[PDB]
Design a protein around this ligand. Sequence first.
Ligand code: GDP
Ligand code: MG
Ligand code: MG
Ligand code: MG
Length: 301
Amino acid sequence: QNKLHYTTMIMTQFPDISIQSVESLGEGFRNYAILVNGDWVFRFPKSQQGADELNKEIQLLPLLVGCVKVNIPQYVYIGKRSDGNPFVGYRKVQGQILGEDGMAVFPDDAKDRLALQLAEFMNELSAFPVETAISAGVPVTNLKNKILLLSEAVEDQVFPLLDESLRDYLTLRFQSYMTHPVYTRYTPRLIHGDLSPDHFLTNLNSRQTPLTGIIDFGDAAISDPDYDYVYLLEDCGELFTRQVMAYRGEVDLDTHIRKVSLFVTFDQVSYLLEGLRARDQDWISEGLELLEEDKANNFGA
Ligand SMILES: Nc1nc2c(ncn2[C@@H]2O[C@H](COP(=O)(O)OP(=O)(O)O)[C@@H](O)[C@H]2O)c(=O)[nH]1
Ligand SMILES: [Mg+2]
Ligand SMILES: [Mg+2]
Ligand SMILES: [Mg+2]
């Protein structure tokens, strides 16, 4: 709940942590993170889903450290809340959070170095033995069926709010994904699942390695490795994404970019659809704003 309340969980379960400073650090849909002594992130689930995602994270992350070059959270304290659900403490992953708006004014030379690090990172995930991840509780995402269910729920619940031009737009997008076997055929791989620049920790005092780490593995799953590109396209732009894909040895950039483009559209609409289900009056006038612009950005595809 409030600050003394999180503080008190730590003191009781970890009384040898001498607490000198406590601050809010960050917050998402699944978690609330504070910073203790400028050193230690304690991250508390906000819901059952959060708690379930952390559980997977708890099992997955100790397996990824040795196989991933950048820093990732390492859960050094593991607490239990009244409900049996966990919370975790970890050494802050050092550096500055990139964010969307901040990739723009990221130094050009560092930018290219970043793309290559991101490429080896994703390569490293795509190399992690899939059945090993599954045994550690990483869910298998049936992306084909999932997108299908999405098409209907958008038909049913989103269409009534859209003008004709926008409805036609989604039909074609969903159709395009489903009609072309190339887009839908893929080898399932471990992905991060929430690979956006608000989880990139950066450092301009490193010319060789301006990417210091990556956080929030809550959405880690077995799926289409192309899905890990979705926020790179949305937040970092298309030129940056072609760079990463090229560094990953992707022969057909155009095919794979168009495919990721669709993934974006499906995310923008799965967003609204969720705001819809949740009665949120502006997680609705927002989800609509981004659909119109997703339509805009794809001006003639
Ligand atoms: N600088 C820094 N910020 C962090 C770290 N861990 C978490 N945060 C912040 O806390 C926010 C929420 O944590 P996150 O794991 O992404 O929670 P979620 O969005 O609910 O899954 C992040 O977006 C960051 O702003 C870290 O190691 N370093
Ligand atoms: Mg997050
Ligand atoms: Mg989830
Ligand atoms: Mg998360």
